[PDB]
Amino acid sequence: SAVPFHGAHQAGIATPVQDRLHFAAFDVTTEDRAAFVALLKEWTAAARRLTAGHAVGEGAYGGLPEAPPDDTGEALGLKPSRLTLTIGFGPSLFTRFGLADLRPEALADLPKFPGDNLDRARSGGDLCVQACADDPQVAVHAIRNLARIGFGKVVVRWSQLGFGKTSSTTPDKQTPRNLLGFKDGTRNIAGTEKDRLDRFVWAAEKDGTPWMTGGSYLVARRIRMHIETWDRASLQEQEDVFGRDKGEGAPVGKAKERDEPFLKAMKPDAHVRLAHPDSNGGATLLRRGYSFTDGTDGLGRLDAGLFFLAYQRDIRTGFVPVQRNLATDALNEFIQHVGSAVFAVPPGVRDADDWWGSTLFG
Amino acid sequence: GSAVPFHGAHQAGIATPVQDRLHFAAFDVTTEDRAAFVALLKEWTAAARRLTAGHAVGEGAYGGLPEAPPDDTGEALGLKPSRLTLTIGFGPSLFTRFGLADLRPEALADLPKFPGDNLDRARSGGDLCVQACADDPQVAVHAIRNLARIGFGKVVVRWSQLGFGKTSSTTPDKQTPRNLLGFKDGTRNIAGTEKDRLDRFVWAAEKDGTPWMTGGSYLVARRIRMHIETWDRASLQEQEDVFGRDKGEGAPVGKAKERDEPFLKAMKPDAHVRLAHPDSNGGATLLRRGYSFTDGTDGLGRLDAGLFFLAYQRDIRTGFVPVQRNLATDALNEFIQHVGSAVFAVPPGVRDADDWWGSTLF
């Protein structure tokens, strides 16, 4: 029904993957540090309400008739829907509020990668909120009301809706398929693997940035798929691109989805072979991305793909090496990265008196 | 999870309980060969029988010749039917092709220009439409993607619209959903159990003058942008006055319960419910079946948000047109703008396994 908001870590990273996403990047419009801290406190208070299925402020109705309602009301009657709200800080935030010397070294700017076609309007951002829930209306309501609360101090830079599985009709254990029709998520870090999360996902105090202890680093990539091109490829071409078969999702030469891959049986430029930790010095990611389908473009093509989200302990040792290794990926024929942003995701809100960003702002 | 039967006197997806998700596509026809188009309709019908039963199209998604593209794109494998319905419609522009000019129904009226219209021509009209509704977005996208693929060379997608959540009801026994203005939308509609009301107001009858359309309906699609910044600063009282119902319960002004009958004289004269109500429009009644959308940001720091309004009716001239004309003075107009428009003739149902979409026309 709901996911606890408080903890050492923000929810929405290691907690169970919800059916739907609304991710928003915001830009900050105030120069006043005190004004921004006040916002973070008001947002935290709102998030406590939202994640428990309650309206923000004094509610969506029943207040003074002459006042705008505190909550815009489109989630009334809905359940918490396992809503999580996860905040992150972009590199550009640290050019404000005297913060330049507190930017973590682990929050690295991404290099340009071969084939990148990044839309500057759908890239970057001073901060992000990742809203995940089983009901898309719950997620949208959250973003819409945070944006409203922050009006005058932040604006929405870009926004992405996504979807994974529908849990009401799909067993939890079953691996979702992406829009290329392949199972996606088989070899990932699971929220159950506490030690692997410590190794690969959570920032530690000895990593160099104390305020980030218990936080993580997020890379977002909006990756368009060339659907109509992919759909004309033979079955064998598609399986060769990945190194797993399409039906069962087993590694080539193996029988079952979760059989461990034998990388040498895969083509040298197969996606799994290039992405696997063993090909990348042990680098391992927590993927937590969502499919998207936004409509059709001016050529009549489906505007669809993967909104890739990766969490890691250090961008320089997680996404960067793995993505660099995909330079010759067979998948590259069929995809294009068109949006990108990175964020530092702070530690959790410890209790009722804490607030988002408290370890940074002090 | 369950399947909705595909065959019947009427197409499913109209009187059917409203599903959670929409993917609507308008297509233009690129072939002038009547026989080629008829063969497409038949192949599409076959596919639809598979898809609505939760089966892959053609020979499947895998297990065929390795050197061939799979017949089904694969991304719905392991999913339930998820109440998928597929509803086809023919736009006025289709009747300029294939010797069909004299068979265009009079009830398929072109809309007049309405005050405030700002229609994008690229996201209006269409030779034909397919409305895919399902509780799982992935299942809806899969259906449209596979129909489009099958249609390659004979049809192109002109425009499409995804709806992330419903803002309509054909099931008064269940909770009425809310639109993004925070109001319940669908209280006084037509229920799928109200056979006499459907016969009166929704299905075309032989005597209406177009035999091939008997058992079909007419569809009006309107893409409506919502000025949420404007709306969100309005007082509670102003918002309730706009509609004539209270926000929390959705009762008519003065009354206690959502489903209490409106007393129209207690509403403001420009209240939406007052203007839209059948009693204000010579008895004209519609089956409303629309969905909410958000398509990112507007470029000005705000979330985009809208309603994709769908209405079914026995005759466009006696349904949508009179009602929309009466909304010329609607208080709601301050907060919305119609930016896309299309009309379609929705043919009768596919009677059995030997029948096909459009068979009464062709």
Ligand code: HEM
């Ligand atoms: C649209 C883009 C992409 C698609 C469709 C895609 C698809 C897949 C699929 C089908 C698998 C195999 C099943 C699984 O273990 O999840 C896989 C594995 C993986 N992908 Fe991708 N991927 C995409 C982009 C990326 C990107 C950008 C990265 C990282 C930079 C990435 C990293 C990985 C990793 C680390 C694995 C697991 C390899 C292993 O340990 O076996 N993928 N991906």
Ligand code: HEM
């Ligand atoms: C963004 C646009 C719109 C919004 C937010 C909206 C909202 C509402 C709401 C809150 C109600 C009251 C609950 C109900 O009975 O469903 C309602 C009723 C209704 N609306 Fe709208 N509506 C919009 C557009 C339209 C349009 C374009 C039409 C027709 C051309 C329409 C026709 C109706 C009708 C017929 C009723 C039922 C009136 C009655 O019989 O009580 N609406 N709408």
